[PDB]
Backbone:
């Protein structure tokens, strides 16, 4: 999953 | 500390140079020095602190995942015994990662959070606290795993409560907080339904507030909304 | 040394894990430990040593170039004075880079080169010696620049003389040596015609020997020949 | 210029 970059 | 003799402004200047040079360990050391001067951080300075440590721990996390995968394969049936080296080296990287997380949490506790009164600073730091406890939780396996998870949860929850009272639903800090808390629910807390619900509600409430924004703010908010959407697509 | 207590084979094993994890500083430290055991290195082990330090110094060189560019711009007419910080930070990175180069050169001198009798080991190490003196030359500006350049030249020349006597023109070590010596001529020694001539002769003599090779050796050699061609296209 | 990778 994507978190804040 | 090794940065104790350098001016605050020089540390900030060098943090920005280190970023341009992709020298994230240096950048983090400069920003740690700047925090340790004892003054509050501006918005730009908070973002430099975050970028620096996010890149350092990101490399450590990626390495840890590679090593943990190898270690897990070595523990399957039929795998040839190779000795203690994979475990040892995974432990080495893990210990370094934990040290970085402890360093960040230490800066937050001494004394960034307690001096942060505005919503934008306080939510930013509490989100960071949740994130670094989350990174600790990714590698935790012992008696304290539950307490580490609850520390991440508690920090994220306090940040959420402030953000919902004090910030619009499109605020990029609020959005990134909700994004990360949703990842916490899915990947750490074994709560995929909570993760999905939070991402969807966050996305929909931001959508409804976009009409209030300038073009530049709209771009900032929609970029993070797209990450919420990407996760929802992965999870559903 | 911090690796003195670890078995040679464990250091090699961990170097390979570090490579997989893209932990090149760790990989270099493990390989330095392995060299310091005092035994000669196999072909695979030489390549691990080279990969580790090439990646470490490569990141340093890229950072140095970013910082040097900023410093040069700060010294143009009309540029606002920003204090000593850019120079200081460029110097910091430069000093770290020089330290890594000195470490590699030290391993080569104590005692890899003197024990290397086969052409494949001796040429490999002499090429490394030329490369790390070349990296020193990229940042040198003082009384010793000429001596650093001549040290790189001398190491490359000895490697070239052995490689031309003892290795076929398609041998990948010979090809990579010639490639790098040609870069030395172009970028360090202010000798673009020598660089071009060396790249062309190397390419043509390798082309004429490809017919002797297996499919796998042909792939190895043609990959490096393409780099010679790419440079020739840039330079002509 | 390209050197050995
Ligand atoms: Cl280890
Ligand atoms: Cl939950
Ligand atoms: Cl510095
Ligand atoms: Cl020359
Ligand atoms: Mg408000
Ligand atoms: Mg031969
Ligand atoms: Na082993
Ligand atoms: Na300055």
Residues:
């Amino acid at each position: 999953a994507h978190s804040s970059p | 500390g090794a940065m104790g003799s350098m001016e605050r402004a020089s540390l900030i200047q060098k943090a920005k140079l280190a970023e341009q040079a992709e020298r994230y360990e240096d950048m983090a050391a400069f920003m740690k020095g700047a925090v340790e001067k004892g003054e509050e951080l501006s918005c730009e300075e908070r973002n430099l602190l975050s970028v620096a440590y996010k890149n350092v721990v990101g490399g450590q996390r990626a390495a840890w995942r590679v090593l943990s995968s190898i270690e897990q394969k070595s523990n399957e049936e039929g795998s040839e015994e190779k000795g203690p080296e994979v475990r040892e080296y995974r432990e080495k990287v893990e210990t370094e990662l934990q040290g970085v997380c402890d360093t960040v949490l230490g800066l937050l506790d001494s004394h960034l959070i307690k001096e942060a009164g505005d919503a934008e600073s306080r939510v930013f730091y509490l989100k960071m606290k949740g994130d670094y406890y989350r990174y600790l939780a990714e590698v935790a396996t012992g008696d304290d795993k539950k307490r580490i998870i609850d520390s991440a949860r508690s920090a994220y929850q306090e940040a959420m409560d402030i953000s919902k009272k004090e910030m619009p639903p499109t605020n990029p800090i609020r959005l990134g907080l909700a994004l990360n808390f949703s990842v916490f629910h899915y990947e750490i807390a074994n709560s995929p339904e909570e993760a999905i619900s939070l991402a969807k509600t966050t996305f929909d409430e931001a959508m409804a507030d976009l009409h209030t924004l300038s073009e530049d703010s709209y771009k900032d908010s929609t970029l993070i909304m797209q990450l919420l959407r990407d996760n929802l697509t992965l999870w559903t």
